[PDB]
Amino acid sequence: SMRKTIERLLNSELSSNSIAVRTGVSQAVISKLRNGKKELGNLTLNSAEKLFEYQKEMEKVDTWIVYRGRTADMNKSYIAEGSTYEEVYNNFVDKYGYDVLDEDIYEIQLLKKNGENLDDYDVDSDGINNYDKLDEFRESDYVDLEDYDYRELFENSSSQVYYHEFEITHE
Amino acid sequence: SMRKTIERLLNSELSSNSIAVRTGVSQAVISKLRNGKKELGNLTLNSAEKLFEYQKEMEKVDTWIVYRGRTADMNKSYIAEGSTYEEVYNNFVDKYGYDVLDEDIYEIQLLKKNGENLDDYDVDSDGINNYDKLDEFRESDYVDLEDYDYRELFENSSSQVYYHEFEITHE
């Protein structure tokens, strides 16, 4: 855990008790670090990591995502929000349901992520048609969708929502 | 220090006395770490740093980082490389420019690292809008970004590049 980051935490206006509660390091240690009775280099690696990780979180850039979707006819508009693409997807389905995005988009994304073949699953605009292979695939061990895959769930979709915009802010 | 690097040193074939003469760390401590008498967490920050800095210099020549960035266009992907995360960023900006990563991500990360409140800088999806206060901060005395911050500039970006992969030799 780098000393310069721990020093930024120790020279901060936070109370020694508040640092202790939030990090799990004793107030006694924090106080001795702040008054010079204990040198920072004398901290154990575990406690140094706890202080370093808390200060990194205090300096972490935040992310907020606003999704805007439009139908090809531009009659209907959709808006979903969240700090990750999964939360945006969850907000979208909570607001508009699970039948607005392309059919089986979640499963199709899983198949694409695992190296599977679209021809084998009879993928169609209506949806995956070969259900028996898909049920066997669920029994098969596979890698779960990552956060980026939830963004692709919107972008791979064209049946009802054709226009997809993701506005990101770090404020 | 970083555990992973120190764990490489202890596990890799070397003499505890040769480690002692090269690093200055007591042979008793190196032996106790290897035999499980001393846990790496209980090692003081001073000794952990001396062990880490040694292994780092012995791996500096062989250390390479490859970054891969995914976008909505499957055909369009970004590659950057370097011995440090900062070098990876410099290769990325030389090859692709400064308008691919999220707006003003470098400056926003710098502001956050220095404890600045983004409200004062009028941050939104367009980036920093209050250029006057940014000019004051640039002319102020501030802490520069450290190496891990450059990995974060890619990791926190989600507008154009939303999936980030780092391949590190760690040797």
Euclidean distance between CA atoms B23 and A157, whole angstroms? 58
Taking Cα atoms as reference points, which of B17, B6, B20, B10 lies closest to residue B53? B6
Taking each helix axis as running N to C, give the angle between helix A85-96 and helix A147-155, from 0 to 180 degrees, rounded to the nearest 10: 50
Euclidean distance between CA atoms A153 and A108, whole angstroms? 9
Put simply, the chain A residues between 109 and 168 with a CB less than 8 A from any chain B CB are 146, 148, 151-152, 155, 166-168
DSSP string, B74-133: SS-EEEEEESSHHHHHHHHHHHH-SSSSSTTHHHHHHHHHTT--GGGGTEETTEE--HHH
Nearest residue on chain A to B159, judged by CA atoms? A168
Is-contact A10 A33, C-beta < 8 A?
A: yes
Q: What φ, ψ does residue A37 adopt, rounded to 5°?
A: -65, -30
Count Cβ neighbours within 10 Å for each residue of B130-159 and write b for 16 or more, e otherwise: eeeebeebeeeeeeebeeebbbbbbebbbb
Taking Cα atoms as reference points, which of A115, A117, A12 lies closest to residue A58? A12
How far apart are the CA of B95 and the nearest CA of chain A, in angstroms? Answer: 24
Which residues of A are less than 8 Å from B40 in CB distance? 45
Euclidean distance between CA atoms B112 and B108, whole angstroms? 6
Type and span of the H or E element at A167: strand A161-169
Type and span of the H or E element at B68: strand B65-70
Euclidean distance between CA atoms A166 and A153, whole angstroms? 13
Which residues of A are less than 8 Å from B42 in CB distance? 44-46
In the block, residue with structure tokens 């907000």:
A91
The neighbour count for residue A124, using CB atoms within 10 Å, is: 12
A60 torsion bin: left (phi>0), alpha (psi -120 to 50), beta (else): beta
Cα-based torsion angle of the residue sequence A139, A145, A150, A152 in order, rounded to the nearest 10 degrees: -90
Euclidean distance between CA atoms A119 and A108, whole angstroms? 12
Taking Cα atoms as reference points, which of A49, A41, A1, A60 lies closest to residue A24? A49
Euclidean distance between CA atoms A43 and B100, whole angstroms? 41
Q: What is the DSSP letter of A164?
A: E
Euclidean distance between CA atoms B4 and B6, whole angstroms? 6
Resolution in A: 2.3
Interface residue of B119, B162, B165 to substitute, partner A, most A CBs within 10 Å? B162
Q: What φ, ψ does residue B49 adopt, rounded to 5°?
A: -65, -45
How distant is the alpha carbon of residue A29 from its chain centre?
34
Domain locations along chain A: 3-58, 64-169
In the block, residue with structure tokens 């791979």:
A156
Q: What is the DSSP letter of B44?
A: B
Contact B115 A60 (CB under 8 A): no
| Token pair belonging to A98 | 């699970």
